Amino acid sequence: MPSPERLDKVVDSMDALDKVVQEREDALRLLQTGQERARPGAWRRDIFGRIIWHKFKQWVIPWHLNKRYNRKRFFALPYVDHFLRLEREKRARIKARKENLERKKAKILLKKF
Amino acid sequence: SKVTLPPHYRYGMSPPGSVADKRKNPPWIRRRPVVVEPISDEDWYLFCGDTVEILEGKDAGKQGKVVQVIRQRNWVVVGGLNTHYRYIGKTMDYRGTMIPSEAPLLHRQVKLVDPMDRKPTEIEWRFTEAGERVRVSTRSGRIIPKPEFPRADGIVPETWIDGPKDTSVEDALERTYVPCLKTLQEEVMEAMGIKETRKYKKVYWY
Amino acid sequence: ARNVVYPLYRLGGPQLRVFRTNFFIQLVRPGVAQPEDTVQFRIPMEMTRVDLRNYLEGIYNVPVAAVRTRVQHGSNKRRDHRNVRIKKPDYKVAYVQLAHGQTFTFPDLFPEKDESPEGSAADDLYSMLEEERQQRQSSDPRRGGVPSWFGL
Amino acid sequence: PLHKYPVWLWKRLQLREGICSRLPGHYLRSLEEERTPTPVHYRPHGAKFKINPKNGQRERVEDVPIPIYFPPESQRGLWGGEGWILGQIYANNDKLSKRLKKVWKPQLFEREFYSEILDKKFTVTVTMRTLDLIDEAYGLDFYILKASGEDLCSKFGMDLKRGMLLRLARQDPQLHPEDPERRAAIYDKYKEFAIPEEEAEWVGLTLEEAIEKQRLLEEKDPVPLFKIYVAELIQQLQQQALS
Amino acid sequence: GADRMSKWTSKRGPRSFRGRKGRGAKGIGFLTSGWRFVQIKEMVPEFVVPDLTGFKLKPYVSYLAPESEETPLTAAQLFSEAVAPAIEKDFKDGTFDPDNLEKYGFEPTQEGKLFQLYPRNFLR
Amino acid sequence: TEKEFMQHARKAGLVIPPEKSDRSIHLACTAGIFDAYVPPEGDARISSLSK
RNA sequence: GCUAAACCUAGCCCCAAACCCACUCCACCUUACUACCAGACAACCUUAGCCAAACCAUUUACCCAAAUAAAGUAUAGGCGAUAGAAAUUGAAACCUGGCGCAAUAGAUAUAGUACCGCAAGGGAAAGAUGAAAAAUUAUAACCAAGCAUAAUAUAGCAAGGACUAACCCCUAUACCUUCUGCAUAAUGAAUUAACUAGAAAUAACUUUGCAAGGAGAGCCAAAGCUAAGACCCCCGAAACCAGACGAGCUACCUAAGAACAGCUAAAAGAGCACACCCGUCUAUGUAGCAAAAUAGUGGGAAGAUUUAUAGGUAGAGGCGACAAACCUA
RNA sequence: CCUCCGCAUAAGCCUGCGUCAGAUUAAAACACUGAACUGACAAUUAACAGCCCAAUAUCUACAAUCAACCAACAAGUCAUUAUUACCCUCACUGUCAACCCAACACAGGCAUGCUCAUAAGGAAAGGUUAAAAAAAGUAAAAGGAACUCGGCAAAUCUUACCCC
Ligand SMILES: [Mg+2]
Ligand SMILES: [Mg+2]
Ligand SMILES: [Mg+2]
Ligand SMILES: [Mg+2]
Ligand SMILES: [Mg+2]
Ligand SMILES: [Mg+2]
Ligand SMILES: [Mg+2]
Ligand SMILES: [Mg+2]
Ligand SMILES: [Mg+2]
Ligand SMILES: [Mg+2]
Ligand SMILES: [Mg+2]
Ligand SMILES: [Mg+2]
Ligand SMILES: [Mg+2]
Ligand SMILES: [Mg+2]
Ligand SMILES: [Mg+2]
Ligand SMILES: [Mg+2]
Ligand SMILES: [Mg+2]
Ligand SMILES: [Mg+2]
Ligand SMILES: [Mg+2]
Numbered sequence A: 001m002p003s004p005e006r007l008d009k010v011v012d013s014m015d016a017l018d019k020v021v022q023e024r025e026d027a028l029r030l031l032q033t034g035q036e037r038a039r040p041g042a043w044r045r046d047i048f049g050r051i052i053w054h055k056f057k058q059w060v061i062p063w064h065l066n067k068r069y070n071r072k073r074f075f076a077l078p079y080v081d082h083f084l085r086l087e088r089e090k091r092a093r094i095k096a097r098k099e100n101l102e103r104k105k106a107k108i109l110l111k112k113f
Numbered sequence B: 001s002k003v004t005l006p007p008h009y010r011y012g013m014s015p016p017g018s019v020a021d022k023r024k025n026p027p028w029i030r031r032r033p034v035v036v037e038p039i040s041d042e043d044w045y046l047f048c049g050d051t052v053e054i055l056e057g058k059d060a061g062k063q064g065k066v067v068q069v070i071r072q073r074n075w076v077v078v079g080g081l082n083t084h085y086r087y088i089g090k091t092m093d094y095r096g097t098m099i100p101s102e103a104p105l106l107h108r109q110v111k112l113v114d115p116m117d118r119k120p121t122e123i124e125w126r127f128t129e130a131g132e133r134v135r136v137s138t139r140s141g142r143i144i145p146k147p148e149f150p151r152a153d154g155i156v157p158e159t160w161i162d163g164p165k166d167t168s169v170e171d172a173l174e175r176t177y178v179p180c181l182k183t184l185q186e187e188v189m190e191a192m193g194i195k196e197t198r199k200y201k202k203v204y205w206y
Numbered sequence C: 001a002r003n004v005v006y007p008l009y010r011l012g013g014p015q016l017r018v019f020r021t022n023f024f025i026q027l028v029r030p031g032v033a034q035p036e037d038t039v040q041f042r043i044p045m046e047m048t049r050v051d052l053r054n055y056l057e058g059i060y061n062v063p064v065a066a067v068r069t070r071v072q073h074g075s076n077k078r079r080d081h082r083n084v085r086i087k088k089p090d091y092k093v094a095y096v097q098l099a100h101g102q103t104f105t106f107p108d109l110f111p112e113k114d115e116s117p118e119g120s121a122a123d124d125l126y127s128m129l130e131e132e133r134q135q136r137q138s139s140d141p142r143r144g145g146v147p148s149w150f151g152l
Numbered sequence D: 001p002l003h004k005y006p007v008w009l010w011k012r013l014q015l016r017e018g019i020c021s022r023l024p025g026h027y028l029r030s031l032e033e034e035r036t037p038t039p040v041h042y043r044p045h046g047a048k049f050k051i052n053p054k055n056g057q058r059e060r061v062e063d064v065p066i067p068i069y070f071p072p073e074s075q076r077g078l079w080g081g082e083g084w085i086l087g088q089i090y091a092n093n094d095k096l097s098k099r100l101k102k103v104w105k106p107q108l109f110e111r112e113f114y115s116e117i118l119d120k121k122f123t124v125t126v127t128m129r130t131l132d133l134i135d136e137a138y139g140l141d142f143y144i145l146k147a148s149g150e151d152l153c154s155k156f157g158m159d160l161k162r163g164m165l166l167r168l169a170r171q172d173p174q175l176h177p178e179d180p181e182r183r184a185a186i187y188d189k190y191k192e193f194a195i196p197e198e199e200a201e202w203v204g205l206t207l208e209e210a211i212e213k214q215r216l217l218e219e220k221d222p223v224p225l226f227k228i229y230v231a232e233l234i235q236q237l238q239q240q241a242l243s
Numbered sequence E: 001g002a003d004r005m006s007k008w009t010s011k012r013g014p015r016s017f018r019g020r021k022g023r024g025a026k027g028i029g030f031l032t033s034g035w036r037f038v039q040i041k042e043m044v045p046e047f048v049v050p051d052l053t054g055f056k057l058k059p060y061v062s063y064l065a066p067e068s069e070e071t072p073l074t075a076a077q078l079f080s081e082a083v084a085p086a087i088e089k090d091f092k093d094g095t096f097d098p099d100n101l102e103k104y105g106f107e108p109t110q111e112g113k114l115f116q117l118y119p120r121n122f123l124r
Numbered sequence F: 001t002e003k004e005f006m007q008h009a010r011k012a013g014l015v016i017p018p019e020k021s022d023r024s025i026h027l028a029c030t031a032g033i034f035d036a037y038v039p040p041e042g043d044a045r046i047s048s049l050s051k
Numbered sequence G: 001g002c003u004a005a006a007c008c009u010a011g012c013c014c015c016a017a018a019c020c021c022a023c024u025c026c027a028c029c030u031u032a033c034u035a036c037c038a039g040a041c042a043a044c045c046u047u048a049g050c051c052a053a054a055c056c057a058u059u060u061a062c063c064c065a066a067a068u069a070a071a072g073u074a075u076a077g078g079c080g081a082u083a084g085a086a087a088u089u090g091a092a093a094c095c096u097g098g099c100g101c102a103a104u105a106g107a108u109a110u111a112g113u114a115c116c117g118c119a120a121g122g123g124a125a126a127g128a129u130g131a132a133a134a135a136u137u138a139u140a141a142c143c144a145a146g147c148a149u150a151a152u153a154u155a156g157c158a159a160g161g162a163c164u165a166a167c168c169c170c171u172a173u174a175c176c177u178u179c180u181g182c183a184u185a186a187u188g189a190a191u192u193a194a195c196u197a198g199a200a201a202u203a204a205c206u207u208u209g210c211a212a213g214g215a216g217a218g219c220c221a222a223a224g225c226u227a228a229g230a231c232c233c234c235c236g237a238a239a240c241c242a243g244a245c246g247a248g249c250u251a252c253c254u255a256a257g258a259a260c261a262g263c264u265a266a267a268a269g270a271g272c273a274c275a276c277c278c279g280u281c282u283a284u285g286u287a288g289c290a291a292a293a294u295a296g297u298g299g300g301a302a303g304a305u306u307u308a309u310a311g312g313u314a315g316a317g318g319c320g321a322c323a324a325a326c327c328u329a
Numbered sequence H: 001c002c003u004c005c006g007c008a009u010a011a012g013c014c015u016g017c018g019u020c021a022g023a024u025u026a027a028a029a030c031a032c033u034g035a036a037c038u039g040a041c042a043a044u045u046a047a048c049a050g051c052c053c054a055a056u057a058u059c060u061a062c063a064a065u066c067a068a069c070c071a072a073c074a075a076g077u078c079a080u081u082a083u084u085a086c087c088c089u090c091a092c093u094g095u096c097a098a099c100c101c102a103a104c105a106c107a108g109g110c111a112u113g114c115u116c117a118u119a120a121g122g123a124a125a126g127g128u129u130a131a132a133a134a135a136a137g138u139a140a141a142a143g144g145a146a147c148u149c150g151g152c153a154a155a156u157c158u159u160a161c162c163c164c
């Protein structure tokens, strides 16, 4: 390609324009409604016991009579606490091994230098 | 453009985005990394463009200028001083033209020299009370300004000529924004004359 | 626009109008034989026929007659070093045709290699290399193998 | 690695976290009380020390509870301190035979009661011990209001208790006007309790129901920042003008 | 065995699966009882392209443009730039009323006008 | 039973310094000579002091 | 000298401290990686089993409240292999490492990647020059198992005694083990490199220290008490329970379809016979084309026949025109 | 020379003998260069089958087998009415191939239509000599089961008796 930098320049220019218009929209929404993130939702717990942010899909009929939305469960049920504890222990082991690696690197740096 | 580098990639003079770099260490070999001095960004006094001096080596006590700096392994090169010998053009029946190539050096082997007396002198970072941050000497108390080096854009602004697809300057700095309580969509709709009579009914969100 | 949640249209609602679109079409030269009226493009995976017609008649203002698109599946067989398949990004090519019977060909952006400006940081090295090649290539088989440096 | 807190303190940690920490003090105390119930399926020992035969030496004795099971039919109705006992029974009352498993079931009598505080009849599959406790407590309302949460072992009992407490606290007209003397006599008969309104609403609720109620009370739609901005602006202009 | 690591496209299922999968295309209508498509003209995204006749602005900026500091455009700056002068003007004379604020651009609800911000009725 | 041969290299020096870089080469000489000196034809005959 | 041998770093295990996290836009409960439509039913339950008592039917620490002495005391226990407290003096806040290792070790990990089954799941080796590879230089070579350089020369468990010289002269039945007796024609072995197999109490022995007292609370004592040293293997089965998975091959059932030339067609769960369903025999191979094949001689082929699609019946069972046949070789 | 094959539909990962450079090394059971390859170029555009049906009440016993004689039994594969509301319209999934399941480029297996051999498609043989042995094919002066436990491949074309 003769000049590939022009493509990246146009890309970052359009990204900056998108960021500017999004910031303007957010400022106008805060000055009018006063709530961040135009996509509504709430913190709901799924079956896997993970605290995720469920996004609304915007339906026509309400939720108390829908057939497909009622099949979407939102409860942990006492059988995922063990899996959550095991995941927490695994992440704790990961963090401890990372801290041990950092300490070993610091010791090597202090020993050689 | 944006390629993810390995966590233990060896920097060997050549930039990561080159054919020789991909030929040297392809993403398949994980050789022993080289531990370097953990130098911060505020203590890095030597730049690219200022004159330096080789401490020891095959030609100690000589002066020279730096043309490229490396912050990953603290590698600096001198403008045709501590160099060796190699060959550029090499074929299967004829090769020659010996062109010397520079060799990188460490920060412990390079000291900054003041242009007043041309002598090696340790330079510290003394924050001036005027506002800016420059380099002040230690045993001499002298100031060494930042060397003027061309940026990586490869173009100087003292002779730039605006092209066909390049705008001027009196239009990019023209105050045309009017702060109001109107969205961009409705504004560009009412500015072009687009009207709408019907409204939007009630909708749920779940 | 792509990757944007579309508003739910109600029976009798306003017209769905988009201002800042997020579509990137690519004019690709046809590989096989094609007539003079059929033009081949490349639209993203989130674009239909009427959307392409409006995009071509609103910006470029090109009279479009018919649009026939299809999905192209990229290759997936190239293996890396750790024995893993490499997935190629897919795309959707288009085949639009003009309306007023106009003709359109694909010019070349390349036959113009007449450039020889002043080169000091690139052409000088090549000039030195070719001069050395012309001055060194002077072997003599009658010598046998003795160097041609000693004048004695 | 090792944990900082034991595995039996995570419930207390979650209660002391954030959303579960905004609960009132009385509700948290009633939840963390944890008191042993009354012996039903076993006779408790008299004194803490019992003189056993064969050897003239005193030894300390203790009364251990019986792990009983509570089916949802117990939570729906009003049962006593009994339930399902999933234990084991030998053959001919001897340990030198076969160890079989036997599960006892209480007796259910579908009767009909009449609450004086609520003035409404309910059909509850009552047993025998519950009827005995009602007869000893001189009515159903007294049996419901005197027995604590560890004695009903049912959700309907706690709901009835909370309803009676709210009716006695709010002083809401139970029956109807034209005869306030009956309502006055009913309120005077049940005057040895009178739990305040701010504490009677959190009696018998579970953890999930309490969290839901606290979230509904602490809902509050986000107020637009325009009002706060104009308030700060008018305050600043008044401060810069009056000086 | 069959593949597992690859995603589920539209070239894997039999005759009963080609159709309901798709490639994420946005529907602009529905179907009827005669195997026909009822396309609604109010569901297709209409591209609004303004006129580009007298527009003197190139997509590339010249290198002679001076740089400046970068700062986000928060809501407080827009408020103090738009509504603050009008409020100060109407209060300095003696006619401001904290009961009505609909004359400054504030809307108590979003169900009155068309382009709502919190539910976002406009596409992009 | 699935191994191949590695080590893929070439023995030829191509161009790579000036391909998208900001560091040139500081030479110390040139290609050939500036102007070729033409000695006199009677140099061997007049190899004395002067004539 | 070819084959090929070593070059340390991703880090790996446990301590002390600290409580650790989860939306950039879109998609994720139906055929997850799918924008858009009318019955809201879905958790609340003694775990079991192996082993031991030389069997085994009672029994067998595992129960999640900090040490110790009491104390392995009273007790429970086919009163036996074992289990086991309580009452009681009491329990000094804060400091950043390895008398552990370096790719057959240490997490399996560069990774839960390839590969196997529809499925749960199982699951392995990787990377070595250099300050300057923008130094493609000339060197640093030298050691195991396999080879040429440099084949054999009569005789003999490959060995010893020897002489001026390999053979020629004499003697001499490989290695560990269940076994009285093994090279026996019993068991194991092609080599090299890495790895792999004696962990511990009461009572005993020796040597310091103190002493009718010893011992850093508790215990012992008619020469005792404290401390130290010294000591007791590895691998290899059929069986049982608990939590999840399978009728896409095969057994049965259900709903909608398809298949069967021609002749004799006696009206037919008729005959010969294409395609088709199964395979009685010969010959070929058993590391083959194939972890069940090749041609005919074979029975049926208008019906108790075969088949494309979708669903259901699964182990204390499913199914069964009953072979203890089948339930992914 | 074979065609006991091929072309489409049904099921199936989806780019798997088109071009270019490398073809020094690497996979062809050896070579050319290519069905056991590295990177770049783009194929397939629907009309084919799907993506389906606004409700309230009500209606549907005289098969198919040329369906016209006759004849049945296993008693059977197809249909509407009254009312209310609705005149915006052509979007989406694939159209390549020498291909699937068996660890494979396997003498194994796969549902329907088309001429049941043709207009589809491929090569039992690398060369040299004719060792022994083995396997697959034609027949033989006289006997035609006298060899073998038994008619065990084979071709003639084959009757009667007994048990179940
Ligand atoms: Mg035993
Ligand atoms: Mg105690
Ligand atoms: Mg390892
Ligand atoms: Mg391993
Ligand atoms: Mg050797
Ligand atoms: Mg001898
Ligand atoms: Mg041994
Ligand atoms: Mg043995
Ligand atoms: Mg023996
Ligand atoms: Mg032997
Ligand atoms: Mg033996
Ligand atoms: Mg052997
Ligand atoms: Mg089946
Ligand atoms: Mg059967
Ligand atoms: Mg028949
Ligand atoms: Mg037949
Ligand atoms: Mg039988
Ligand atoms: Mg086709
Ligand atoms: Mg096979």
Ligand SMILES: [Mg+2]
Pocket: H121
């Ligand atoms: Mg042909």
Ligand SMILES: [Mg+2]
Pocket: none
């Ligand atoms: Mg051949």
Ligand SMILES: [Mg+2]
Pocket: none
């Ligand atoms: Mg041959």
Ligand SMILES: [Mg+2]
Pocket: H140
């Ligand atoms: Mg004969």
Ligand SMILES: [Mg+2]
Pocket: none
């Ligand atoms: Mg005979």
Ligand SMILES: [Mg+2]
Pocket: none
């Ligand atoms: Mg025969």
